[PDB]
Every structure is written in structure tokens, then in C-alpha cells.
Design a protein around this ligand. Structure first.
Ligand SMILES: CC(C)CCC[C@@H](C)[C@H]1CC[C@H]2[C@@H]3CC=C4C[C@@H](OC(=O)CCC(=O)O)CC[C@]4(C)[C@H]3CC[C@]12C
Ligand SMILES: CC(C)CCC[C@@H](C)[C@H]1CC[C@H]2[C@@H]3CC=C4C[C@@H](OC(=O)CCC(=O)O)CC[C@]4(C)[C@H]3CC[C@]12C
Ligand SMILES: CC(C)CCC[C@@H](C)[C@H]1CC[C@H]2[C@@H]3CC=C4C[C@@H](OC(=O)CCC(=O)O)CC[C@]4(C)[C@H]3CC[C@]12C
Ligand SMILES: CC(C)CCC[C@@H](C)[C@H]1CC[C@H]2[C@@H]3CC=C4C[C@@H](OC(=O)CCC(=O)O)CC[C@]4(C)[C@H]3CC[C@]12C
Ligand SMILES: CC(C)CCC[C@@H](C)[C@H]1CC[C@H]2[C@@H]3CC=C4C[C@@H](OC(=O)CCC(=O)O)CC[C@]4(C)[C@H]3CC[C@]12C
Ligand SMILES: CC(C)CCC[C@@H](C)[C@H]1CC[C@H]2[C@@H]3CC=C4C[C@@H](OC(=O)CCC(=O)O)CC[C@]4(C)[C@H]3CC[C@]12C
Ligand SMILES: CC(C)CCC[C@@H](C)[C@H]1CC[C@H]2[C@@H]3CC=C4C[C@@H](OC(=O)CCC(=O)O)CC[C@]4(C)[C@H]3CC[C@]12C
Ligand SMILES: CC(=O)N[C@@H]1[C@@H](O)[C@H](O)[C@@H](CO)O[C@H]1O
Ligand SMILES: *[C@@H]1O[C@H](CO)[C@@H](O)[C@H](O)[C@H]1NC(C)=O
Ligand SMILES: *[C@@H]1O[C@H](CO)[C@@H](O)[C@H](O)[C@H]1NC(C)=O
Ligand SMILES: *[C@@H]1O[C@H](CO)[C@@H](O)[C@H](O)[C@H]1NC(C)=O
Ligand SMILES: [Zn+2]
Lengths: 151, 907
């Protein structure tokens, strides 16, 4: 229940590891084969970024989708009148670094509604609470949460 | 052929070699190399009217939802507008064990007292030395240190933690006895997979003295296999002779390098105990590697059969040349297979056909060379052209029939429904035919081309040849005539015993293990010694496997069962869905679907669990979600005018997802809509009460009664066509059924063609029926021996049944065609003459393949030793039976009653 500090990985080990994260497998396009694995969230209580207007965030991995919904409903309790903001769920234009998990869809960078500072630090530990795999304080601008995939 | 073969064999030899080399180059150039990725490459049947439905269902599950523009049947994603925009002391176990992680069970040595404390410490340390002492990516690494992330996941860790020590090996062993009593008292309790992250538990606690999240582990997942519920006595403390160890890592293709480099050469573990079960998930992976490597046993086979071919006829060069002829025939047959007919596959068994191929080859050359020597014996100072003509006239047709028999055998095996044997059949059949033609052309040439301290060895060769001669000259006739009833009675009794072991006693039975676990390696190999001897000794596995898995009823409407998959011999790849021409929207349509669910709510196989909300048919779900006013859609009839229907279906299901979305991952009752807004398929399911067996009969009763009912559709014109579609997970059922029916019908066609060619050769009904008796007795006793060795049917030992008949008639045909030199007695002299004439021929023609398969035996990949043993048995039996019997019965029958139509044919 602490405001997770700057640059703090909760699983205590780097992302590309079989502990809660595994490793990257393959790219995904709008027409790739494995793209079927992705689903839209469309939970109206959450506000999306959608700077690409193609739904780069509004869709994700169902395994990650359920966990994100869990975090949404759990932070609605501890913080009222908030609207969580996923800045980048799945990147295809490449706004992130290469071979990044965001390209896979097992990860999403999360911020609060009104762009608050200490709320990020607490929200990281909250993302831990909902049961997320590799929540890392990637940037001061966004909280980075990444999940393992099934199969 | 004979016209210009006279002293001009170089031309035909050269054109044959050119043919061979060009076909080899084409075969290695144009088609794509075979995969050998998975042995079970094509086991799933095709075109069997159920596998049709099954493959369509699977193809459908493939084209599932894609978040935006799924572009297939799945869902409603179009409406996205929505009118808006350890080394530690404790707490040391990161996760709980599961099937996902890799595992290894340990067996004790002669000490057999597994609760020995050095046994435990040795277990853990040898495990870590043999596994962890290698470059390892790691494990979950809950802490920062990636080394002692998950310590060995062993029971030693458990006893250490009950001792509450940061070090597993340090064990005074008193706590071992304490926890021994504890485990006894706990096995008394039946004691849950509690969370227990803290001491307090929501469920009732049988006893706090049971350490949280510890005893249930040893009792249910860990080394304990003997189920540890004896109620005998403290003195009766067993050893738990079987023990299991999970790997701190996880099972997957990656572990392949570790097992290969680090865990094969090791003869065993240690004198205290040793490995017996190595389940690392990586079985199909390294399979092909053992295949490649363990291929020198066929090399020993081919070289020893070449050697004995030399022994037979001293013309060593002829032996080498006919061997190369066999091999080249294999090659050109492969070329014809993959290329000429544009169909390609290679199901791992064609790399076993080669043995019986070279057997039949060497068979068909002996007869030719011996006929050549016979015709050279008389009138040797004659014309080479005439010699060729006469020896050909006397041997070629014999060769042709004695090969065309097995040719037709395999071209009959084609009729089955397994792909992984359709391909084998066609390939080996064209192979044997091309072998015959290449022999009948090539061999004459190379034969006629043979224009051409050692003394004592040559003398022993001469003497042993004369010994064989006299043995076949006096001994065998003496035996068969002097008994003339003993062998016949003995073989009647053996046929009886065979029919008995196949009929009522432990008999031929369908496969038992699950599809993906066909024992592919030698049963003594650890990987599969895991299965069939240990998997059924573990609480989690056993109590998980075959337990309360109610198979689901299921039905479709949107699609039609058309396997667009290269129907005739698919490549085990290639499928494509489609759409029907129905409309769910009609008022009578949804009314009928409702009434359908109603009727199905009255049946026997149903199981009214009464816990569902959204899993059964969604029409009643509408009904409940209806009467929702002021949105607007409410206050209507239970049927609808298709308009409220079309507007409300998407609206409502989207609102169900909006309330609390639950994943619908192409298994749910979720109706199917496409990229643009239209519902297309109406999948819905149920729950049966049959508990997912594996044996045939229960599944058959189930599927038969169920499809019997659902076939009665009697629906309205819309969605009334071929919509039956009832399909469970009964794939294994389909494999089994088609395997049985296929081996049956194939055996039938094989015996039919054998009897027909027996007619066409001997022209006597009587001796043909007698040969039929012969081959029937042979196949019966050999399959009886097989089942005595506990050999279920599979993709492999099915074709063996049918090929056995072809291999068997190969001797009866000779003993039948040999009814010449009609003596005064109707029986006496003719049979002894035939026997003395064909003795060495048949005996060597058998012993060759016998010794081939015999030296083949000790290997690792199952298929090899399987085929080796089968051929050894079938050849031994076919020879001995054929001779002894098919003369004994003939000794007591007069075959001078026949039917002749034209005397023109010769042989
Ligand atoms: C390499 C393979 C795949 C193709 C070629 C195989 C045969 C066509 C070759 C191999 C060995 C050759 C033989 C090697 C030696 C001789 C002996 C030679 O004898 C003489 O010239 C007779 C001399 C005399 O006695 O006066 C005649 C050619 C011949 C039969 C050769 C004919 C062609 C043969 C059979
Ligand atoms: C000795 C000859 C005259 C008769 C016996 C032939 C066999 C030894 C051949 C025939 C088919 C061959 C197989 C055909 C295809 C493959 C797949 C091929 O796959 C690869 O090359 C991928 C992996 C790698 O690069 O090693 C490896 C060899 C292998 C198993 C071959 C192993 C050797 C086999 C069994
Ligand atoms: C004509 C002489 C040379 C004897 C040939 C004997 C075999 C080599 C033949 C007999 C049956 C044949 C098969 C009969 C039918 C087919 C299906 C055919 O594919 C289709 O018909 C696909 C569906 C369609 O288009 O109708 C591909 C060849 C194949 C396997 C044939 C392969 C060659 C076979 C095994
Ligand atoms: C299904 C296919 C692949 C079978 C191919 C078999 C042919 C290679 C064989 C079968 C019948 C054979 C023929 C059977 C009988 C004769 C007659 C023979 O001459 C005589 O008998 C005439 C003198 C006399 O009467 O003694 C010369 C060989 C020849 C043409 C044989 C040549 C080789 C033939 C065509
Ligand atoms: C070499 C030939 C002459 C004999 C052996 C080949 C087949 C005739 C055998 C081998 C496997 C046997 C089958 C193995 C197991 C079963 C299941 C068994 O199931 C039942 O008893 C349920 C009721 C039913 O199947 O009708 C029925 C016999 C059957 C189909 C057997 C029928 C006879 C088969 C096909
Ligand atoms: C009296 C003379 C003329 C008999 C000549 C033939 C025998 C030497 C053959 C016939 C059947 C053979 C047996 C067939 C099968 C086997 C099983 C084989 O072991 C396995 O295949 C085990 C497989 C498994 O673990 O299931 C060991 C050899 C053995 C006993 C063979 C030993 C040699 C036998 C007795
Ligand atoms: C009269 C004999 C000496 C010669 C003529 C018969 C033999 C050539 C063959 C015919 C059938 C064979 C039998 C077929 C099957 C078996 C079962 C096989 O059983 C086992 O190895 C496993 C036994 C078990 O564990 O149940 C042992 C060899 C044996 C008796 C074989 C021994 C050799 C036999 C008698
Ligand atoms: C069962 C037991 O005594 N476990 C001991 C514990 O008492 C002690 O507090 C700890 C620190 O040394 O080491 C461990
Ligand atoms: C060979 O196996 C035995 C167990 O049967 C084992 O004691 C011995 O150590 C092994 N050989 C070597 C060199 O380790
Ligand atoms: C189903 O059967 C029960 C018992 O016979 C009966 O009460 C009920 O009305 C039936 N319902 C339908 C729809 O047939
Ligand atoms: C689907 O319907 C839309 C109209 O909304 C049309 O533009 C599109 O071409 C249709 N696509 C297919 C594959 O029928
Ligand atoms: Zn990120």
C-alpha cells in the first residue's frame, strides 16, 4: 500500500525472464495470423488515449484485458471519481523501442485520469495488487504493467 | 526384350542408370523435403463423415475473433462506435507445482527402502548436479538471485522447511520421522489445496499441526506415488519405492539441449537410486534425432543380407548389382511418389517399408538366378539369346505374380481412411511394382554379362552346399511323409489356439493411451517408461485423468461439413470454412430453436447441473434479458418480427459484454457475426453424463444414440439443411473406429486378391482352398503371437496385418505351381517331388528376411523393432507352416480334380 518509488520493479527481475513474463515471441500486424488472439476491452468506465485512432490501446490480450479490468475496479474503490488512462497498449507504428512487449500486447503503460504524480507511485503498487506480472516504474509519465501470456 | 538383349546389355544398363540418376536429381530438386517434425503426422482420419464434422469444427475454432475486423464468422466487433468517440529461511516456494513444469521420477536401487535419508540427500544433490550444473536461463526468480530461485522442488526441501532451515541438505533426520508421523495422520485426513498464505484458513482446518501448504503437496503432487492410504500397521511402513521430482524449471522445447548434452550418456544416477521416468515434454522434438542416428541397424541389416546373398550364389558382383537395383528402385519409386502424381506426404513409415522391400527384392532375384543356373545346366552349349528367352519364359511370370501379390496387398491397404497409411500403401506399392519391372529388365542384362589357402574354404563351401542339397533331398520328404498326421494335428491345434486368443481371451484391442502419447520409443526407454507405468501412479495425474469430464453435446447451423482439404489423401494440411444459406431471423426460426432447447431439456444423457447463466442456448437468455424497458426494446412476444430481432440481438449481446464482459474464446455458445453486421452461425452446447471414456463401446453407444436423436431435425425450411452437426470431442473415437474398420476391410481385400491370383495360377479350386486354409492359419497364429506380446493396434501394426497375407502366399504359390511330373500315385510322388524341387529356394527366400529382421531388432525408435519382430515371426511361420502343412494336407488329398479352360498359358 506504498507509493512505489522511482524505477522499482516489483517481481525483482528484468522483464524478459520466465518469472511472470517469459519472453517475446513474434510481431503482430493488423493482418497477421496470431492477431486473432487480441480482443477489444470496451469497458466504458475507462478512458483511452487512441492517438493513432486505430485503437492501439482499446485492444489488447484478453489475459491482460481481465487483469486491467481488475485493476480498474480495484482502484475505483480506493480512489473515487477517477478514470484510468492507458497510454499505449499495443504498438504497431513503433512509437516504442523495437522488440518491446507492447508490440506483443502482453503489456500496457498506465496513467491516472488527471495526470497526477504521487497517484502514479501508489498506482504501481496497486497494479501489483490486482495480480499483474511485471509492473515496472518505466517512466515518470506512465506506469508500465506487463503480463505473461498463456499457451 | 530378348530380341536385342543378346550380347547388347550395355545399352539397357546405361539407360536404366540414366533413368535412375535423372529421377534422383529431379526428386531432390523439385519437391520439398519431408518434414519428420511429428510422428503422429497424419493419424487423424479424413472423410469419415465424423472427422469431416470434426475438422470443420476445428477449422471454425481457428478463424475466431480478431479484435477489430475479425473478418470471419466470430462476432459483433463491428459495433465499435457505441454512439461516442531456498537459501532463504522460509516463504520460499514461489509457485505451486503443475503440469507445466518439467519433472523426473526416481527409482531406488536394490536398497528398495526409499525413505533412506542418504537416499533423500543423494536425490537432491545429484539432481542439482545433473541439471542445475549447466547454463540455465533460470526459473521464476521471485528474489533477485536467479540461482536459488526454486530449490530443486524436492521433498528434501519440504522436510528442511519443516525443520525451518535455509539449507536442504543439512538433515539430522529426526524431523524426517516427525513428518513421517505427520504425513500418516494427514493421509488420515481427506486436506485441501488451501491458499494459506497466512496460517488462518477460510475452510475448516483439520489440524493446525499440518503445516500450511506442505502436506497436501507431498500427498498429492510430490514423490509419493503409492497413494499412501494403507491401514495395516506402523511396522507396515512402506518405502514409497517410486518417487517423483519436479524441475524448478518448466517443460518445453528448450530443455532439449539440456537432456541431449547432459542426461543421455549417464548410465544411471548412482548406486543409491536411479532415474526411471524422464518426462520433459520434449519427446517429439528429439525423436527425429534418434531416428537419424539410430539408422545403422538397417545398415547392418542390408550388409548382412548382401553377405548371405553372396553365400547363396557365389557371383558376388551379381549380388552387389541386384542390391543396387533394389536401392535404385526405392529411389525412383520415391520420385514417382512425390512428383509424378503431384501429391506429397511422407509419414515416417516409408522409412520402415524399405526393409520388407529389400526382402521381397532379394527374394525375387534368387528365383531368377537359380532358374538361370537350371537352364544353363541342360544344353549349356546353346545360344545365349535362346538361353535368355527360355530362362525368362520360365521365371519372369513367376516373379511377376509373386510380387504383384504384395503389390495388390498395398494398393488394397490404400482403401483405408487413415492418411498416414494411405500414403504408405501407395508408396510401397509403386515401389514393389517398379522393383519387379527393374528386376525383370536389369537383372537379365547383368546376369548374361557375367561371362566369367582359398582351396580349403572353397571345399567347405562345396561340402556344405551338398549337405544342404541332401537335406532338402531326403530329410524333409521323409519327415512329412513319415508323420503325415503329426504336423497337421499340431497345426490345427495352433490355429485353434490363435483363433481363441484372438476371439475371447485377452485379444486384439484398440489403442488405450491418449492420441498424443502413442509410445513411439522403446518401452524400456525412460521417456515413455514414464507413461504406462508411472503416470498412473500419481494423485494429481490419475485423480485428474479420467474424472468427472462430462463430454459436451454441441450443434452448429451456420456452416456445412465440406472438407475442402485435398479429400483424396490430404497432406494433413489444408482446410477452409464456408457459409450456409439460412436465416436465423425468421420468427419460426427462433421459436423452433427455443422449442429445440426445450425438448433437449428432456432426455437421458442430459445433466441438469443448474449453475449456468450464459453457457446453454442463448434464446432463453434473450428471454430473461428481455422485459427490459425504457432503453427501446421490450414488451413483445417470445418470437419476433425479425426487425426487433435484428436490432436487439447485437444491442443486447453488446450490453451483456458492457455490463461485465466475459471472454468468449470460440468455445462458448456465442453466436457468430461477421465483419459487417450479420449473424452467421449459432453454436450452442450442453453437458452429457458419460464421463469421457476411452474404450470403444461406451463412446459408440453414446454417439450412436445421440446422433440418432439429433438426426431427427424436422425443422422449418430455414436452417433445415444438414444442420445436425452434433460433435463432441470424440476425435479419439473416430481414430479408433476407422482403424478397426480399415484393418478389417484391408485384410479382406488382401485375402481376396490372394485367392484370386491362386486360382489364376494353379487353375485348381481344391489346392487354392487348401492354400487359403494355410494362409489363414498363418495369419491367425502370427497375430496370436503378437497379441501375446501385448501389441495394441496403431497406425503401424495395422498395415502389418494385411501385408502378412501377401508375405504368406509367397510360398504357397510356389508349392502350388510345383504340381508337375504327374506320377502314378495321385498324392505320393508329386508332393515329394515338388518339395525336393523348391526346398532350398523357399528356405533361403525365407531365411534372408528372417535374419534381416532379426539383426534389425535391438534399436530405440519403436517402429524399427516393431517391424523387425513382426517380419521375423511372419517369415518363420509362413515358411514352416507353408511347407509342413501345405504338403501334409496335400499328402492326404488328391488334387487331380481341377478345371482347365485353355492350355495356352505356361509357367
Ligand atoms: C559403375 C556402374 C554403376 C556402371 C558400370 C558397371 C558395369 C557396366 C561395368 C563395371 C565392371 C566392368 C567390367 C570390368 C572388366 C571387364 C573385363 C574386360 O575383359 C576383356 O577386355 C577381355 C580380355 C581378354 O581376355 O582377352 C571386358 C570388359 C569388362 C567385362 C567390363 C565391362 C563393364 C563393367 C561390367
Ligand atoms: C543408407 C541409405 C542408402 C538407406 C537408408 C536411408 C536412411 C538412412 C535415410 C532415408 C530418409 C532419411 C531422412 C530423411 C529426412 C530427414 C530430415 C532431415 O532434417 C533436417 O535436415 C533438419 C535438421 C538438421 O538440420 O539436421 C534430417 C535427416 C533425415 C532425418 C533423414 C535421415 C536419414 C534417412 C532416414
Ligand atoms: C496407370 C498405371 C501406371 C498403374 C497405376 C497404379 C497406381 C500408381 C495408381 C492406382 C490408383 C491411383 C490413384 C487414384 C486416384 C488418385 C487421386 C488423385 O487426386 C484426385 O483425384 C483429387 C480429387 C479430384 O480432383 O477428383 C491423385 C492421384 C491418385 C492418388 C492416384 C495415384 C496413382 C494410383 C495409386
Ligand atoms: C504388368 C507388366 C509390368 C508385366 C510385364 C511382363 C513382361 C516383361 C513379360 C511377361 C510376358 C513375357 C513374354 C512371354 C513369352 C515370350 C515368348 C518368347 O518366345 C517364345 O516363346 C517363342 C519360341 C517358343 O515357342 O519356344 C520370347 C519372350 C516373350 C516375348 C516374353 C517377353 C517378356 C514378357 C512380355
Ligand atoms: C487377421 C484377421 C483374420 C483377424 C484379426 C483382424 C481383425 C478381424 C480383428 C483385429 C482387431 C479386432 C477388433 C478389436 C476390438 C473390437 C472391439 C469390440 O467391441 C465390443 O465388443 C463392443 C461391441 C461392438 O463392437 O459391436 C468388438 C470387436 C472388435 C471390433 C474386434 C473385431 C475383430 C478385429 C477387427
Ligand atoms: C524353434 C526355432 C526354429 C524357432 C525359431 C524362431 C525363434 C528363434 C524366434 C521366434 C519368435 C522370437 C521372439 C519374438 C519376440 C521376442 C520379444 C523380444 O522383446 C521385445 O520385443 C520386447 C518388447 C516389449 O517390451 O514389449 C525379445 C526376443 C523375442 C522373445 C524373440 C526371441 C526369438 C524367437 C523365439
Ligand atoms: C514345435 C516348435 C519347436 C517349432 C514350430 C513352431 C515355432 C516355429 C513357433 C510357432 C509359434 C511360436 C510361438 C509364438 C509365441 C510365443 C509366445 C512368447 O511369449 C513371450 O515371450 C511372453 C510370455 C508372457 O509373458 O506372457 C514366447 C515364444 C512363443 C511361445 C513362440 C515360440 C516358437 C513358436 C512355437
Ligand atoms: C524451527 C526453528 O527453530 N527455526 C529457526 C528459528 O527459530 C530462528 O528464529 C531462525 C533465525 O536463526 O532460524 C530458524
Ligand atoms: C554405472 O551404473 C552404476 C549403477 O548400476 C553406477 O553405480 C555407476 O556409477 C555407473 N558408472 C559410472 C562410471 O558412474
Ligand atoms: C419434459 O418432461 C417432463 C416430465 O415428463 C414434463 O413435466 C415436462 O412438461 C416436459 N417438457 C417438455 C418441454 O417436453
Ligand atoms: C460487408 O457489408 C458492408 C456494408 O456494411 C460492405 O461494404 C462490405 O463490402 C461487405 N463485405 C463482405 C465481405 O461482404
Ligand atoms: Zn512500457
Amino acid at each position: 500500500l506504498t507509493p512505489l518509488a522511482y524505477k522499482q520493479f516489483i517481481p525483482n527481475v528484468a522483464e524478459k525472464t520466465l518469472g511472470a513474463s517469459g519472453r517475446y515471441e513474434g510481431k503482430i500486424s493488423r493482418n497477421s495470423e496470431r492477431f486473432k488472439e487480441l480482443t477489444p476491452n470496451y469497458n466504458p468506465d475507462i478512458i483511452f488515449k487512441d492517438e493513432e485512432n486505430t485503437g492501439a490501446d482499446r485492444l489488447m490480450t484478453q489475459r491482460c484485458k481481465d487483469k486491467l479490468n481488475a485493476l480498474a475496479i480495484s482502484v475505483m474503490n480506493q480512489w473515487p471519481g477517477v478514470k484510468l488512462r492507458v497510454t499505449e497498449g499495443w504498438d504497431e507504428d513503433g512509437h516504442h523501442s523495437e522488440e518491446s512487449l507492447h508490440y506483443e500486447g502482453r503489456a500496457v503503460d498506465i496513467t491516472t485520469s488527471d495526470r497526477d504524480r504521487s497517484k502514479y507511485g501508489m498506482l504501481a503498487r496497486l497494479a501489483v495488487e490486482a495480480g499483474f506480472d511485471w509492473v515496472y516504474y518505466e517512466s515518470k509519465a506512465h506506469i508500465h504493467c506487463s503480463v505473461k501470456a498463456e499457451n | 526384350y530378348a530380341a536385342l538383349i543378346a550380347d547388347w546389355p550395355v545399352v539397357v544398363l546405361g539407360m536404366c542408370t540414366m533413368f535412375i540418376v535423372v529421377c534422383a536429381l529431379v526428386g531432390v530438386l523439385v519437391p520439398e523435403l519431408p518434414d519428420f517434425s511429428d510422428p503422429l503426422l497424419g493419424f487423424e482420419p479424413r472423410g469419415t463423415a465424423i472427422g469431416q464434422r470434426l475438422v470443420t469444427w476445428n477449422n471454425m475454432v481457428k478463424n475466431t475473433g480478431y479484435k477489430a475486423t475479425l473478418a470471419n464468422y466470430p462476432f459483433k466487433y463491428a459495433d465499435e462506435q457505441a454512439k461516442s468517440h531456498n537459501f532463504h529461511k522460509d516463504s520460499f516456494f514461489c509457485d505451486v507445482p503443475s503440469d507445466r513444469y518439467s519433472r523426473v521420477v526416481f527409482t531406488s536401487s536394490g536398497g528398495e527402502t526409499l525413505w533412506n535419508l542418504p537416499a533423500i540427500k543423494s536425490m537432491c544433490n545429484v539432481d542439482n548436479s545433473r541439471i542445475r550444473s549447466h547454463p540455465q536461463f533460470g526459473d521464476l526468480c521471485q528474489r533477485t538471485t536467479a540461482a536459488s530461485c526454486c530449490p530443486s522442488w524436492t521433498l528434501g526441501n519440504y522436510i528442511a522447511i519443516l525443520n525451518n532451515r535455509s539449507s536442504c541438505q543439512k538433515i539430522v533426520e529426526r524431523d524426517v520421522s516427525h513428518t513421517l508421523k505427520l504425513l500418516r495422520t494427514c493421509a488420515k485426513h481427506y486436506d485441501m489445496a488451501a491458499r494459506r498464505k497466512d496460517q488462518l484458513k477460510c475452510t475448516n482446518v483439520p489440524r493446525k499441526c499440518t503445516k500450511y501448504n506442505a502436506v497436501y503437496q507431498i500427498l498429492h503432487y510430490l514423490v509419493d506415488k503409492d497413494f499412501m492410504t494403507p491401514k495395516t500397521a506402523d511396522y507396515a511402513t512402506p518405502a514409497l519405492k517410486y518417487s517423483m521430482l519436479f524441475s524448478p524449471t518448466e517443460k518445453g522445447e528448450s530443455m532439449m539441449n539440456i537432456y541431449l548434452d547432459n542426461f543421455e550418456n549417464w548410465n544411471s544416477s548412482d548406486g543409491v537410486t536411479t532415474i526411471t521416468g524422464i518426462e520433459f515434454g520434449i519427446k517429439h522434438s528429439l525423436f527425429q534425432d534418434y531416428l537419424l542416428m539410430d539408422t545403422v541397424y538397417p545398415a547392418i541389416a542390408i550388409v548382412i543380407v548382401l553377405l548371405v546373398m553372396c553365400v547363396y550364389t557365389k557371383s558376388m558382383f551379381i549380388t552387389l548389382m541386384t542390391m543396387f537395383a533394389i536401392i535404385s528402385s526405392l529411389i525412383v519409386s520415391y520420385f514417382l511418389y512425390r512428383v509424378v502424381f503431384h501429391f506429397e506426404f511422407f509419414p515416417f513409415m516409408n522409412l520402415t517399408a524399405l526393409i520388407i522391400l529389400v526382402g521381397i527384392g532379394a527374394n525375387n532375384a534368387f528365383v531368377l538366378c537359380d532358374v538361370w543356373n537350371y537352364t544353363k545346366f541342360d544344353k549349356p552349349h546353346a545360344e545365349t539369346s535362346e538361353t535368355v528367352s527360355i530362362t525368362l519364359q520360365h521365371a519372369a511370370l513367376s516373379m511377376f505374380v509373386t510380387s504383384f501379390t504384395t503389390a495388390a496387398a498395398f494398393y488394397a491397404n490404400y482403401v483405408s481412411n487413415i492418411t498416414a497409411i494411405r500414403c504408405f500403401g501407395v508408396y510401397a506399392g509403386t515401389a514393389i511394382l517398379v522393383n519387379y519391372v527393374l528386376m525383370v529388365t536389369w537383372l537379365p542384362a547383368v546376369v548374361v554379362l557375367h561371362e566369367r589357402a582359398c582351396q580349403k574354404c572353397h571345399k567347405v563351401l562345396f561340402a556344405i552346399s551338398e549337405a544342404s542339397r541332401i537335406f532338402f533331398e531326403k530329410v524333409l520328404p521323409c519327415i512329412v511323409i513319415k508323420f503325415r498326421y503329426l504336423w497337421l494335428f499340431w497345426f490345427l491345434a495352433l490355429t485353434v489356439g490363435g483363433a481363441y486368443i484372438v476371439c475371447i481371451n485377452p485379444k486384439m484391442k484398440l489403442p488405450s493411451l491418449e492420441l498424443s502419447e502413442f509410445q513411439v520409443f522403446r518401452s524400456s526407454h525412460p521417456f515413455e517408461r514414464y507413461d504406462a507405468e508411472y503416470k498412473k501412479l500419481f494423485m494429481f495425474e490419475r485423480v485428474h485423468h479420467g474424472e468427472e469430464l462430462h463430454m459436451p453435446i454441441t450443434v452448429i447451423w451456420g456452416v456445412s461439413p465440406e472438407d475442402n482439404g485435398n479429400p483424396l489423401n490430404p497432406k494433413s494440411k489444408g482446410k477452409l470454412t464456408l457459409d450456409s444459406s439460412f436465416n436465423i431471423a425468421s420468427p419460426a426460426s427462433q421459436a423452433w430453436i427455443l422449442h429445440f432447447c426445450q425438448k433437449l431439456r428432456n432426455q437421458t444423457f442430459f445433466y441438469q447441473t443448474d449453475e449456468q447463466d450464459f453457457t446453454s442456448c442463448f434464446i432463453e437468455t434473450f428471454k430473461q434479458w428481455m422485459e427490459n424497458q425504457d432503453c427501446c426494446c421490450s414488451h413483445w412476444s417470445f418470437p419476433y418480427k425479425q426487425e426487433i430481432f435484428e436490432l436487439c440481438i447485437k444491442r443486447a449481446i453488446m450490453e451483456l459484454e458492457r455490463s461485465t464482459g466475459y471472454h468468449l474464446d470460440s468455445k462458448t455458445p456465442g453466436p457468430r457475426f461477421d465483419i459487417n453486421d450479420t449473424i452467421r452461425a449459432v453454436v450452442l452446447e450442453f453437458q452429457s453424463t458419460y464421463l469421457f471414456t476411452l474404450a470403444y463401446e461406451k463412446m459408440h453407444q453414446f454417439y450412436k444414440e445421440v446422433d440418432s436423436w439429433i438426426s431427427s431435425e424436422l425443422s422449418s425450411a430455414p436452417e433445415g439443411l444438414s444442420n445436425g452437426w452434433f460433435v463432441s470431442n470424440l476425435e479419439f473415437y473416430d481414430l479408433q473406429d476407422s482403424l478397426s474398420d480399415g484393418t478389417l476391410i484391408a485384410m479382406g481385400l488382401s485375402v481376396a486378391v490372394a485367392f484370386s491370383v491362386m486360382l489364376l495360377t494353379t487353375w485348381n479350386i481344391i489346392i487354392s482352398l487348401y492354400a487359403i486354409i494355410s494362409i489363414a492359419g498363418t495369419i491367425f497364429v502370427t497375430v496370436g503371437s503378437l497379441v501375446l506380446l501385448g501389441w495394441e493396434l496403431n497406425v503401424l501394426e495395422s498395415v502389418t496385418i494385411s501385408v502378412a497375407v501377401g508375405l504368406s502366399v509367397n510360398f504357397a504359390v510356389h508349392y502350388g505351381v510345383a504340381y508337375r511330373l504327374a506320377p502314378d500315385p495321385d498324392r505320393e510322388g508329386k508332393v515329394i517331388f515338388s518339395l525336393s524341387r523348391v526346398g532350398s529356394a523357399m528356405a533361403m527366400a525365407a531365411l534372408t528376411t528372417f535374419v534381416a529382421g532379426a539383426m534389425m531388432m535391438p534399436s530405440t525408435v519403436l517402429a524399427y523393432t516393431q517391424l523387425g519382430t513382426f517380419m521375423m515371426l511372419i517369415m518363420c511361420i509362413s515358411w514352416a507352416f507353408a511347407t509342413f502343412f501345405f504338403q501334409c494336407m496335400c499328402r492326404c488329398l488328391g488334387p487331380q480334380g481341377t478345371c482347365g479352360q485353355i492350355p495356352l498359358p505356361k509357367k
